[PDB]
Amino acid sequence: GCKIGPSILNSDLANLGAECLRMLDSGADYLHLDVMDGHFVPNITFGHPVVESLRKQLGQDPFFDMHMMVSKPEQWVKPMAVAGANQYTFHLEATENPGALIKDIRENGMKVGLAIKPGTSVEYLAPWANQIDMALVMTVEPGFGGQKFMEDMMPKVHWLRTQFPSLDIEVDGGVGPDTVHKCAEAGANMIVSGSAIMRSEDPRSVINLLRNVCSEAAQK
Amino acid sequence: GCKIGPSILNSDLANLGAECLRMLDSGADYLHLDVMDGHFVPNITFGHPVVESLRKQLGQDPFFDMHMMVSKPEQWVKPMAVAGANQYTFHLEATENPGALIKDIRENGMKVGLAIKPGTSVEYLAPWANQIDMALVMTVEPGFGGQKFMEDMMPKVHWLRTQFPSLDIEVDGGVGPDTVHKCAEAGANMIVSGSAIMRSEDPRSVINLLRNVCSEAAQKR
Ligand SMILES: O=C(CO)[C@@H](O)[C@H](O)COP(=O)(O)O
């Protein structure tokens, strides 16, 4: 039950379609699409209009996990749903009312993800863990790709896996073949990887390696 | 002195390099790149990281006109300059001190654009017109492509042309083979056109049509 979702942050953003196509053709389980509004984080990536074009290019079948690093996650729920996103992962730090937002995401037919930044206590998630589909434990400060993996986040992952056996747990930031085992042994089952996968001639082998390390570690 | 800059807002954003390349090959004078942060306008497009990738794909020749529909234009000046943008067009309504921002843009080596929304009186643009390279008169409410041209904006263009004869004046929003006449006769010499060029089977001829109409008006003056 371990899935690999490449991030395209450090890809050729002038050719997102081709970049994502290579990922899917290489056996990626899903695509992790980083949406930044220049406000919640100090960078701007793209929003629902790019997602709409991607969905048209990539077809109906691929799974889009939207990492919504935006200050008003309430605003982009319908636009993302209409564009064809499968999962809407908002930041607990950004919402005025998590309960209302979770409901709205579900009314819009999308799965619900909830992300926390490194400095955010994992216990902030407790009241919500039973209402969401996936918790995203950031392992770098959000805003940029290619940052250093924060191993000190692993106790958050372990705590979530122990307290909520059924919850999908995603890690995001500096995850690659060097750090994936740490994530898997802590309890993560959804693995975002960007820079580590993006340069490869044979992304399929790297993706398979991440997935296999993660699955065998989970089998324990 | 008339120039046509297609907008790629309603293009295939998953294939943005390809869309820009074919605009350039079709004779575009420049590329007009719409940057929206979801705050200044209710939509999000892309920012400096996409510009960087485009500059790498297109090379150093093409001119990028950055339409900065962002609420903190001060924040993105350096990042856009580093990404390879040529001109930074910010909104008058998006800053408390346009004078300081204008200075910072030039210090970062870029050309300076200054834009006003339809609801914003052209009078407020005037104090800065002698300090900028290009004034942008919006002819639709910013945030979305394919909207209807607001011909009621033409007196803004005409007034700027009269008061600032050497100023480059851009119009943006619903400009096409029909409405370009109004823009040209009013005094605009820089034409942004999105849906009219992008959804055309013959972008070259559309671009030629827009430039020719504008030149004819430019000559008459
Ligand atoms: O959300 C983010 C950054 O804000 C992550 O998705 C990064 O894009 C992960 O990329 P690498 O750290 O694997 O390069």
Ligand SMILES: O=C(CO)[C@@H](O)[C@H](O)COP(=O)(O)O
């Ligand atoms: O800045 C904008 C919209 O905010 C323009 O650049 C749009 O791209 C309008 O293009 P048209 O499709 O109306 O020509």
Ligand SMILES: [Fe+2]
């Ligand atoms: Fe992410």
Ligand SMILES: [Fe+2]
């Ligand atoms: Fe524009």
